[PDB]
Symmetry: D2
Amino acid sequence: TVKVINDPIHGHIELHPLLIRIIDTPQFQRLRYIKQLGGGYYVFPGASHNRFEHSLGVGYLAGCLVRELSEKQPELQISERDMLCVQIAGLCRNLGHGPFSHMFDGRFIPLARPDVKWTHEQGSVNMFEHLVNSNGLIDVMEHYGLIPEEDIWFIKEQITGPWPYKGRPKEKSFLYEIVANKRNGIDVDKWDYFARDCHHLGIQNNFDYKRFIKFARVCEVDNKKHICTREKEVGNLYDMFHTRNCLHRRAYQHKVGNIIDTMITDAFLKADPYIEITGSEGKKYRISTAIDDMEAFTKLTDNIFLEILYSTDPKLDAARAILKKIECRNLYKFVGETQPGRQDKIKRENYESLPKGVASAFIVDVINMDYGMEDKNPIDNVRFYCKSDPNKAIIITKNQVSQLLPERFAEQLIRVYCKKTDEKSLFAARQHFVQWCLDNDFTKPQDGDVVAP
Amino acid sequence: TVKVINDPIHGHIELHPLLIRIIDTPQFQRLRYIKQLGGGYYVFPGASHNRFEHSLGVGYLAGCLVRELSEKQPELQISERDMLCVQIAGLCRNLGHGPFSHMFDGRFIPLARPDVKWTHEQGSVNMFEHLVNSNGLIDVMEHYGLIPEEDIWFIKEQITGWPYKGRPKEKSFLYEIVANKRNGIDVDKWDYFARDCHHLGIQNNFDYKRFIKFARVCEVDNKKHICTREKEVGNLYDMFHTRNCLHRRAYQHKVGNIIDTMITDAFLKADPYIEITGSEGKKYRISTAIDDMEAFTKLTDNIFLEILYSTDPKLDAARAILKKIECRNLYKFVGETQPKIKRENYESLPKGVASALKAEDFIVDVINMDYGMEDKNPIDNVRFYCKSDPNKAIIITKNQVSQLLPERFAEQLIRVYCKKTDEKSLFAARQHFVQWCLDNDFTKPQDGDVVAP
Amino acid sequence: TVKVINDPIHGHIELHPLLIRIIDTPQFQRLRYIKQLGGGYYVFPGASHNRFEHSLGVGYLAGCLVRELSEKQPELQISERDMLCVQIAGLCRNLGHGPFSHMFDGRFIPLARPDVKWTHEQGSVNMFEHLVNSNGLIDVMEHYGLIPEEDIWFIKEQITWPYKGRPKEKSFLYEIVANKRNGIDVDKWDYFARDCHHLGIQNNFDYKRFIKFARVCEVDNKKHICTREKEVGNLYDMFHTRNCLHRRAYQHKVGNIIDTMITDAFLKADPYIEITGKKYRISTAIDDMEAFTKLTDNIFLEILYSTDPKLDAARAILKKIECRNLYKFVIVDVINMDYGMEDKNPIDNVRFYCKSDPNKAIIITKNQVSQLLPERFAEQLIRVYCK
Amino acid sequence: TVKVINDPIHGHIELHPLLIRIIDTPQFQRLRYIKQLGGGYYVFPGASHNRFEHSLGVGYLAGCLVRELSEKQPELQISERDMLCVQIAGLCRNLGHGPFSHMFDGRFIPLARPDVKWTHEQGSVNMFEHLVNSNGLIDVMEHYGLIPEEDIWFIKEQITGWPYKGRPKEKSFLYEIVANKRNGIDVDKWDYFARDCHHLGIQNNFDYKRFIKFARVCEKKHICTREKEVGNLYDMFHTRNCLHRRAYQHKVGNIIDTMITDAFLKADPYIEITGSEGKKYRISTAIDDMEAFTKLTDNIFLEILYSAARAILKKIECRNLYKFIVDVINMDYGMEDKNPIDNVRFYCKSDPNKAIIITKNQVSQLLPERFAEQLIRVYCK
Ligand SMILES: Nc1nc2c(ncn2[C@H]2C[C@H](O)[C@@H](COP(=O)(O)OP(=O)(O)OP(=O)(O)O)O2)c(=O)[nH]1
Ligand SMILES: Nc1nc2c(ncn2[C@H]2C[C@H](O)[C@@H](COP(=O)(O)OP(=O)(O)OP(=O)(O)O)O2)c(=O)[nH]1
Ligand SMILES: Nc1nc2c(ncn2[C@H]2C[C@H](O)[C@@H](COP(=O)(O)OP(=O)(O)OP(=O)(O)O)O2)c(=O)[nH]1
Ligand SMILES: Nc1nc2c(ncn2[C@H]2C[C@H](O)[C@@H](COP(=O)(O)OP(=O)(O)OP(=O)(O)O)O2)c(=O)[nH]1
Ligand SMILES: Nc1nc2c(ncn2[C@H]2C[C@H](O)[C@@H](COP(=O)(O)OP(=O)(O)OP(=O)(O)O)O2)c(=O)[nH]1
Ligand SMILES: Nc1nc2c(ncn2[C@H]2C[C@H](O)[C@@H](COP(=O)(O)OP(=O)(O)OP(=O)(O)O)O2)c(=O)[nH]1
Ligand SMILES: Nc1nc2c(ncn2[C@H]2C[C@H](O)[C@@H](COP(=O)(O)OP(=O)(O)OP(=O)(O)O)O2)c(=O)[nH]1
Ligand SMILES: Nc1nc2c(ncn2[C@H]2C[C@H](O)[C@@H](COP(=O)(O)OP(=O)(O)OP(=O)(O)O)O2)c(=O)[nH]1
Ligand SMILES: Nc1nc2c(ncn2[C@H]2C[C@H](O)[C@@H](COP(=O)(O)OP(=O)(O)OP(=O)(O)O)O2)c(=O)[nH]1
Ligand SMILES: Nc1nc2c(ncn2[C@H]2C[C@H](O)[C@@H](COP(=O)(O)OP(=O)(O)OP(=O)(O)O)O2)c(=O)[nH]1
Ligand SMILES: Nc1nc2c(ncn2[C@H]2C[C@H](O)[C@@H](COP(=O)(O)OP(=O)(O)OP(=O)(O)O)O2)c(=O)[nH]1
Ligand SMILES: Nc1nc2c(ncn2[C@H]2C[C@H](O)[C@@H](COP(=O)(O)OP(=O)(O)OP(=O)(O)O)O2)c(=O)[nH]1
Ligand SMILES: [Mg+2]
Ligand SMILES: [Mg+2]
C-alpha cells in the first residue's frame, strides 16, 4: 500500500510500497541523526533539519521530473520500473554522509586520512549495498517488478557514475541527469535543499523548480539524448547558480559557522584514537576508520558529538575541552577575510604552511566558491529548444543572455582566525593579517583601514 | 553588546548581553538536543526543531509584549529591570524538559517513579538555579542593573507560580506574560503555534501580532490584568481552537503517541543499566537523574542512540524495542473511542479489554483534550475593554459571543493498540475493542460497522 | 497548444488550448473588473484581487480533483473529455457575478426589483451561453472532442434522475464544481487560500490533503465522492474556516456598511445610468447578457466622475465613502452565518471509508467525532447603522 | 486617534491620526484605481494590486526606519515632527502616477506631448499641494505639531529634491529614506520587492528587516550599514534587476502597455475630463490641472471599451495581440552606467562612527563587470 508523508516543503508526497521498504531500515533511518548543515545550526537556530527529510524530498522531486518526461514524451518509452529506480536513487543519494554532513568528508576525513579517496557519493552506494543485503530487499525488488542486478547497477550509477554505463542503454542516457547531473549540476538534489535550507534558516530562495519542470524536455544533441529546457528560461538557470552561490556566502560558508566546524573536527581528531565503534563481526573502529565497514558507519552519526561531551574518560578530556569551548561560546576570534588571484590561488598541498606565513608578516581556512563545474560555466553545458522546433536544441552563450552576468565563475576566499581571545592578541593578530595581505599582494580587507592604518 | 539571531519564525531578534550569557551555558545549550515534539518527528519529518529554538522565541515574544505595555501605558512604570526579568523567564521557561519533551514528564517519570511529583516547571527553576550558580552570573545580573535576591524569585515565579513576593501586586500583570496561570494566554503558546506549524506543515489560525496590538492593562477587582479589546474575543476562542487542532492533528497522533510509548517502554527496561554522572561524581539512572542538575544537564535525546548502539548484553530488551521502531514494527492501532477515567484507573483498562490475547497484549492511551483549564472556559477569566472607556474591564460571556462555540470544554479520547500484529490477532483485537465499548457504554468507533459487523 | 499561467496561489497551472479560447472572450475577461470581496478592499487593503483570477483557480482545482480520480480509479470510465467539461464549469462558475459581487446579487437587486429572483448561478449559465455563442466556439468544442448538446447541458447543470448532462453512473462529477449535497466543492478551496493570502488572514484547511484521500464509493446504489475516516475532523475545520472568513472579513461591520452605501448610490443612480441595441439600466442589465458584459465595478467610478445633476444624490454618497464619512455603527443588517445548508449539518451528508474495505461508505455522526463541536450550525446576527 | 490596518505584506500597521486624514481624501483614494504593475496584470493574474496599498507600505517602512534611528542614536536629535514628515513623504511619493502607472509617464505622455517634461514626482508634489488645499489640512497639520511652511517644503523635497530649504544639512540623512538620490536604497524599493513578489508569484531575495537592524548615521551625514551587509546590497539591486526581467519588462506584458498607449493616443481627440471650473481636459492634458488628474485613473480604459480606439482594446481582450513596433528597454542598477554601491559607506564593529568605502573587488569577483545594458524587442502588428 502507498503511504503519504506531510512535508513543510512539498506537502503530501506519495511513496511506493517498495520505497517504504527502503526507508524503514536502520541504514536509512540513520539519517535522522545527521544534520544537513552541520555546524550551521549553532549560528542559524532554525537549521535543525537532518539528512532524512532531505532524502525524502530528493526522492519525491526525482519522481516528479521523471514522470513529467514520460507523460509529455511517451516516445521515450519510460517504464514504471525506470521511474521507481529513479526514485530509489533520489532517496539513497544521501546515504553516505557522515557526522554533521560536509564536515566529515570535507574536513575530518581529509585531515585524518590524507591519502584515502572518499566522498559521500561513494558512501551512498557502499551504504546502499549494505542496506539491500542486510534487509533482504533483493526478493522485495523482484516482487515489485525490478530486475536486481541491472537495476542495482542503474541506481548506483545515478549516485556516483561509472558509453561507460552498465545499468541502462545509452538510448536512455537522460535518466542520469535527474538525481546527480555530472554534466551541468541541474539535478533534483539542488532544488530540494534550496527550498528546505531557506525554509529552515530563514533566508530567501531565487529559483522556482516547478516552473523548470513544466518546461523540461529530452532532446538529441551530439548523437546523445540530454535533458533540455526552453530558451526563455535561460535567465533563471543563471539565477539558480546565483541562488546556490548566495546560499553559500550567507550560511554554508559563514565564518562563525565554519570556525565551529573546524573546532568539531579538531575535537574529533583528538577523540579519534580512543572512540571505539563496534562494526561488523564484532570488530572495533575509530571515527576515521568506520567508513571502511558499513555496519560500523551505520552507527556513526552526530551522537559522536554528545558521546565526547557527556564523557568521563580521561583520554577524551582534550576533545571534551574543545566542545566545552563551543557550548560556552568561547570561539576562535575571526580576524579578517581576503582573496587571492585566479593565478595566485593557493593549492591544497600548501594549506599546512599558511599560519606560519601570517605569523611572519592562528587558523586559516580556504574556501573555493565556484558554480559547480570548477572554473567553467555550467550553462554552456545546457541545450535549449524553441517553441517552433522542440527537437532542435541550440546553444545559448553567456554573452547572448546579459551583459551583467559574472565575468568569472570561480573564486577563492581566505578566512583567518586567532585562538587567543586577548584584546591585545586580537589587535596584534589583526595587524599581522593586514600586512600579510599587502605582502602577498592579496585584496584589501573590508575592515582594513579601521583595525590597522 | 547585543547580538542578533535570525529565526525562520520571527526574523532578526535582538538579545540583551545578559540574555546572551544566559544561553551560552551548557544547561541552556543542552536544549539543542531535546526534540520539541518528541516522537512526532517519526510521523511529521519536518518536526526536527528542538527546545532551544523554541526558548528564544518565547523570550523574544515575552519582550515584545512587555515592551508594548511599557510604551503604551507609562502609568504602569515598567522598568528596564522588569522587562529584562520577563525575557529571562521566557528563555528559561523550558529548561526543565527531559528527553523527547512531554514524553519524559508525562510518561516515563510517572511509571519509573510514581511516588514523586515532578513537572518541567519544577525542573526549569531547579535548572535555572544551577545555571546561574555554575556559571557565576549573579554578579553579571548585578552588572546589568538587577537585584538578584528579588529578581531571581521573580524569574522563578513567572515559570512555576497575594502569593508572589518577587514583584508587588501593583505589577501583577507581569505574571500573565510568560506563563499565564489565570487563563493560559501567554507568549509560550504563540511561539509553538507558529513554530510547530512551520515545521509540521500544518496551518495556524491565530495571529499574535494582532493580539499584542490591542493588549492593555486595566484595573478590575482592584487588581491589574492584561486585557484586549471587545473585538478580539472571537480570535481568542480560535486560539484555543487552534491549540486543539495542533493537538488533534500532530501532538496526539495515534502513531506518534505509540512511538512515544515504545521509547518509554525501552527507557524503563534500560533505566537500571545506564548511569548518568554528575554532582560530586555520583552515578544516576534515567529516572533518578532528575534529582541532580549536573546529571540532568547531560540527560537529553542522546539516551535514545546510546541504547541503540549499546554493546551491553544487559540492554537487549531495551535495544529490541528501539529497533522495532527503526524497522517500524510498531504496535497496531485498533480503534479510538470516548466515554471521565481517573488517572489512577489507567493501569486497569488493559485487563478490561481482554475480558470483553492476554492483558499485556493491549495498550490503552487516554488523552485529555481540553482548553487549558480542565472543564472551565478560559475566556470567562478574560476581561475586555471597549473603545469608549478603555479603562473599564467588562466581561463577555459565551452566549454574547456566539452560539456556535463548543458546548463543553473538556473531553477524553481512548486509543487501543495491540502488541500482536498478525492478521488473526488484529482481528480479535478489533472484536474485543468494539465489545469493550458496549460493556462500558462508550462512543461508537468510526470504523466499527465495517471492521466488526 | 498549451499555455501555463503563474498564479500566486497554485503556482504554474497548465490550461488546455480550448480553455484558453474561452478565457480570451469579452465575457470572461470582464471579470478582471469585479472585485472578489467587493467592499472588503476598503477595509482590508490587500484584497484587490478580482473575479478573473479566482476563476482560473476553481477550474485548475477542478482538473486536479477529476484527474486524481481517474488515475486512482480507471473503473469509472472518466474520459479525457469528462475532465475537460468539469474544468469548463469551474472556470464559468463565476461569470454571473455583478458589480462588487455579493453587493449586487445580495442586496442591490433584492431591493431594486423584488419581483425577480436572481442568482449568480443563473447569471453564469446565461453569460456562459452568451459566451459560447458570441464567440462562435461551439465550433471549437467539437474540435477538441466534445458533443455540445449534451456537454453544454452537463456544464450548466454543474453550475445550477434529474440531470440530463450525464447518467447516474457519472453522478460524482456533479460534486466537484458546485456541490449541492454537502458543499465540499473546489470553489471553496480556492477562495479559502486566495482570500487569506490577499486579506492577510490564516487559512486552516489543507485541500491538497483532502484530494489525496478522495475516492468515489457506491452508497445507496449511487456513486458519491468520499474521504477517509481520519479526515472528518478536517472537514469540520473546513466550515470552521469558512465561518472565520465571514466573521473576520466577509461580514466585517464596516465592510458591510460600505457595501450598503454603494447599493444606495446605485439605487438613486438606477434610472439615470444608461447601459447600451437598446439601452439598459444597472437594474435591468441582468436581462440582457450583452449589457451585463459592460456592467462591472466601473459603474462605481462612472457615477463618481459624472457631472449630470440627476446623479447628484448618488454621487454625494460615493463622496461620503472616499472621505470615510460612513454610517456610524449603532439601515439594519441581518446576517445568517450557517454551514452552507441552513440549519443542517453538512457532515451528515458526507460518507467515509476505511482501509479494511475502501468500498464501504459509512456515515459518521457528530457525537462520534468530538464532543467539543458546535451545538447548532446556523445562527442569526442583527446590526443597526445610523444613516 | 490611531488606526490599525491589516496588510498581507507588513501585517498590522499603525497610522497617526494625521496620516488617516491624508488617506481619507479623494486625491489619495484615487490610487485605489491605478494598478501598480499596469499591463503585467494581463500576463501575471495575481498582480492586481494598486498604488494605494503600495503607498501605505512605503510610509510604514519610512516610519520604521526613521523610528529605528531615533531609538539607537539620540545624538541625532530626531523629533516626532521629523518622523511625521517622513511618513507623509512615504505615503505621498506615489500620488502623481497616472493610469496604469508607468505606461502613462513612460510611453504615453512622451508620445502624446513630446514637448512636455512630466514625471510622477512632479505630479506627486503637485497633487500633494492639491490634497492639503482641497481638504483644508493646513490647520490640522499645525494642530498635530507641524510647522506647515517649513515642513511641507521638506515633504515635497523628500520626493523631488546644502540646497535644501526644509531641513538643515545637520539632518541630511532623512532625505535618504523616502527617495534616495545618492544610491537608491530607499524604503519605496523595499515595499514593491515584497508586494510585487507576493502577488506576481515571484521570489524575493532581499531582507529589508535585516538591513534596518544594521543602519547607522555617520559623518555631511549619510545612512550606512555594517561591512557584512555589502553582499546583501548587490543582491538587492540584483533582486530587482531580476524583477524587471520576469515581470516589469515581460515581452507580452510590455506589448500590452504599448497597445494601450496607441488606444489612448487614438482616444485623445475625444477624451473629455472636467477640471478646475468645468473646463474640459483630455487624457494628455489632465496633468496640467490636478482637479482633472484626480479623476484620471484606469477608468478611462473601460470608458473607451464600453463606448477606432475601441478596436485595439477589443484586440487585447480577445488576445489578438501583436506577435513577438520596436521597444527599447534600459536595464540599469538605477544610476545609469554608474555603480550604486560606490556611493554607500560602511562601518565596522570596531569604530561604529568611522565610515569606510568598500569596492567591488573587495566583495567578490562573481559580480557584474558593467552595470547597464539595453535590450531591443521587435513585434509584428
Ligand atoms: N497537513 C496534514 N498532515 C497530517 C494530518 N494528519 C496526519 N498528518 C500527516 C502525518 C503523516 O506524515 C502523514 C500521514 O499521516 P496519516 O495520519 O494521514 O496516516 P496514518 O498512517 O497515521 O493512518 P493510516 O495508516 O492511514 O490508517 O500526514 C493533517 O491533519 N494535516
Ligand atoms: N552567542 C551565540 N550566538 C548564536 C547562537 N545561536 C545562533 N547564534 C548566532 C548569533 C551571532 O551573531 C552569530 C555569531 O556568533 P558569535 O557572535 O557568538 O561569534 P563571533 O565570531 O561573531 O564573535 P563575537 O561574540 O560577536 O565578538 O551566532 C547562540 O546560541 N549563542
Ligand atoms: N554548513 C555547510 N554545508 C555545506 C557545505 N558544502 C555543502 N553543504 C551543504 C549545503 C546543502 O544543504 C547540501 C548540499 O550538499 P550535498 O552533499 O547534499 O550534495 P552536493 O555535494 O552534490 O551539492 P552541489 O551539487 O555541489 O550543490 O550540504 C559547507 O561547506 N558547509
Ligand atoms: N536573513 C539573514 N541572516 C544572516 C545573514 N548572515 C548571517 N545571518 C544570520 C545568522 C545569525 O543567526 C545571525 C547573525 O549573523 P551575523 O553574521 O550577522 O553576526 P556575526 O556575529 O557572525 O558577525 P559580527 O560579529 O556582528 O561581525 O543572522 C544574512 O545574510 N541574511
Ligand atoms: N512508514 C513510515 N511512515 C512515516 C515515516 N516518517 C513519517 N511518517 C508518516 C507516514 C505514515 O502514514 C504515518 C504513520 O506511520 P505508519 O503508517 O507506519 O503507522 P501505522 O500504524 O498506521 O502502520 P500502517 O499504516 O498500518 O502500515 O507517519 C517513516 O519513516 N516510515
Ligand atoms: N508530541 C507531543 N507534544 C506535546 C504534547 N503535549 C504538549 N506538547 C508539545 C506541544 C507544544 O509544542 C509544546 C507545548 O507544551 P509545553 O509543556 O512546552 O507548554 P505548556 O505546559 O504551557 O502547555 P500549554 O501551553 O498549556 O498547551 O509541547 C504531547 O502529548 N505529545
Ligand atoms: N515564476 C515565474 N513566472 C514567469 C516568469 N516569466 C514569466 N512568467 C509567468 C507569467 C505567465 O503567467 C506565465 C507564463 O509566462 P511565459 O513568459 O513563460 O509565457 P509566454 O506566453 O509569454 O512565452 P511563450 O509564448 O511560450 O514564448 O509565467 C518567471 O521567470 N518566473
Ligand atoms: N479610515 C480608513 N480605514 C481603512 C482604510 N483602508 C483599510 N482600512 C481599515 C482600518 C479601519 O480600522 C478599518 C475600519 O474603518 P474605519 O475605522 O475608518 O470606520 P469605523 O466604523 O471603525 O469608524 P471609526 O473612525 O473607527 O470610529 O478600515 C482607509 O483607507 N481609511
Ligand atoms: N464582502 C462579502 N463577500 C461575500 C459575502 N458572501 C459571500 N461572499 C464572497 C466571499 C467569497 O470570496 C466568495 C464565496 O462565495 P461565492 O460568491 O464565490 O459563491 P458561493 O455562494 O457558492 O460560496 P459558498 O458555497 O456559500 O461558500 O463571495 C458577503 O456577505 N460579503
Ligand atoms: N489579521 C486580522 N485583521 C482583521 C481582523 N478583523 C478585522 N481585521 C483587519 C481589518 C482592518 O484592516 C484592520 C483593522 O480593522 P478592525 O476591524 O480591527 O477595527 P475597526 O476600525 O473596524 O473597528 P473599531 O473602529 O476599532 O471599533 O484589521 C482579524 O481578525 N485578523
Ligand atoms: N508593468 C511595468 N511596471 C514598471 C515598469 N517600470 C517600472 N515599473 C513598476 C515596477 C514597480 O512596481 C514600480 C517601481 O517603480 P516606482 O514607480 O515605484 O518608483 P521608481 O521609478 O523610483 O522605482 P526604482 O527606485 O527605480 O526602483 O514600477 C514597466 O516597464 N512595466
Ligand atoms: N493568452 C493569455 N495569457 C495569459 C492570460 N493571463 C495570464 N496570461 C499569461 C500566459 C501567457 O503565456 C502569457 C503570455 O500571453 P500569450 O501567450 O497569450 O501571448 P504571446 O505573445 O506569448 O502569444 P502565443 O499565444 O504564446 O504565441 O500571459 C490570459 O488571460 N490569456
Ligand atoms: Mg458552493
Ligand atoms: Mg526610487
